[PDB]
Amino acid sequence: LGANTAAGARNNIGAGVPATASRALNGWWKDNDTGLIVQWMQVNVGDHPGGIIDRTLTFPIAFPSACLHVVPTVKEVGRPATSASTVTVADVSVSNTGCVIVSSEYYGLAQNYGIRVMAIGY
Amino acid sequence: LGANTAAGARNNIGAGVPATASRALNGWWKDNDTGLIVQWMQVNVGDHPGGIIDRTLTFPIAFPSACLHVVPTVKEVGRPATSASTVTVADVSVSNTGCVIVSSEYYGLAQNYGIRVMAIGY
Amino acid sequence: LGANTAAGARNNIGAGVPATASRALNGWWKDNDTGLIVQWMQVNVGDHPGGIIDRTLTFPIAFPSACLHVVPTVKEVGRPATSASTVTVADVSVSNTGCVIVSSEYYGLAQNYGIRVMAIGY
Ligand SMILES: [Mg+2]
Ligand SMILES: [Mg+2]
Ligand SMILES: [Mg+2]
């Protein structure tokens, strides 16, 4: 083993450490080798009223240093008049604690949509 | 090492286990520390005929317990009259075995689109 | 330990190796057990002029063998007249070095959009 400590042992045999996770609907996974954190979350919104709608989403845990990337998509909660695919999204701002997602619609009927976000950071 | 078993050895030096994967177009990666599984897949559809279209997608492998998150996006297979970016998607339902993705179009010309999904679960 | 080499030691106790990463805005993470690489990137574009727009994006690093999956989404850089959610995207082609993303708009006002891509490969 060439050492008397766990850290020294792993370094000498080139081993990594276990990842950790919260395996929840709004959850996260952390690589404890590099510190990278991946998170995923969702929020149910309801109908899109038209125009431009901003919504703040809070990550399951805060990134300790930075959020590097977000991946926003649309979920359908129900189909009252038309499908949630008539709503589209883009990210407005990204922070260590959450993001702002903007949505708009291209069909003016009632939806029941939600927003999903996957995020990468550390 | 402080133990006579591989599991006990790793616990004593704080080491994790190797991830496994199928590095395929429709593939998966599994963290065998936490059990988290990430999958990715695609299906070629063709033209969007208008209206609302639901399609069932089957994951490369079933999640043993639950799918936590899906990330659906649109791929362009070809460009017969207009681009596949005129088709948009949302997820309708998510299970341990697959998902239903709904699509609609905002330009009524011929596309050749497909659906991509990335999924997280365990 | 049952061996005199680091690789043999890890095999005998069933330990994996540390992942590596570039924790940058345009960055990557590599599982050195399976070789899977995840990358993320963004590019600011500006206004969508209408019609169909193709753009080539270059991955932070080349995948040594193949890109298996891409996840393109839209970011809002600013809001000059309307939101970037009125622009939508699809992937046209994917290679070991990058991808081509096609975009179109469903509202003919000025945007300031960018393109985000998450990619999986090895
Ligand atoms: Mg509506
Ligand atoms: Mg069509
Ligand atoms: Mg414009």
Residue numbers in the entry:
A (entry chain A), B (entry chain A), C (entry chain A): 580 to 701
Task: Quote the study on this structure.
Specifically, it is known that R1-subtype pyocins require the presence of common Pseudomonad outer core L-rhamnose to adsorb, whereas R2-subtype and R5-subtype pyocins require inferior outer core α or β-glucoses.
We were unable to produce soluble yields with a corresponding construct of R1-subtype tail fiber from P. aeruginosa, LESB58. Of constructs tested, only one produced a soluble yield sufficient for crystallization trials (R1-NTF; 16.18 kDa). In R1-NTF structures, only the complete foot (V596-Y701) and partial shaft (L580-G595) domains are present. Like the corresponding region in the R2-NTF shaft domain, the R1-NTF partial shaft domain (L580-V596) is a twisted trimer that contains a single helix (A585-I592). It also binds a small divalent cation that is coordinated to R1-NTF residues E684, H627, D626, Q690, L688, and two waters. Although glycerol is abundant in R1-NTF and R2-NTF protein preparations, only the R1-NTF structure contains a high occupancy glycerol at a site formed by residues T635-F638 (β8) and S672-I680 (β10, L4, and β11), and located ~25 Å away from the distal loop network.
